[PDB]
Amino acid sequence: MAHHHHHHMGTLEAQTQGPGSMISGLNPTLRLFKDHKILYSNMERGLKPLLEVDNFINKYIQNKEGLEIYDKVVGKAAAVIIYNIGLQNVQAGVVSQPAKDFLESRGIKVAYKKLVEKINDRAESLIESLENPEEVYKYMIKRGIIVNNL
DSSP, X not given: OOOOOOOOOOOOOOOOOOOOOOOOTTOXXXXXXXXXXXXXXXXXXXXXXXXXXXXXXXXXXXXXXTOEEEOSEEOHHHHXXXXXHTOSEEEOSEEOHHHHHHHHHTTOEEEOOOOOSOOOOTHHHHOSOTTOHHHHHHHHHHHTTTSOOO
């Protein structure tokens, strides 16, 4: 038994396709992981840096909770910033002694390298309570170690 079909006009009107993507041979010097698995990949310089992905962590990263991060150099600015982000699992290539100390002191599990005892910054010998990142942040402007440029 066959069925006779009733014909119908297509009448379709589609929309433009979205943008593609690009890579850089420099590779993501900044990175986010979950269960050591690559969650996200980013640069600290260029468009959408470590500063901007911080400036909306909550909005960009829904899974901020218990997440891991990777950076280049944990200086004073990177110490205050990582503390501002509030991540418990971090990795870096290099780290300043007061920075590594502060991170491990907050109970942040970190993987990084540098053999030093003291970075010559006068805030250390002046400020009694190294609890508040805003005290050192001002001196961080004074020495200008907020910009990653030697």
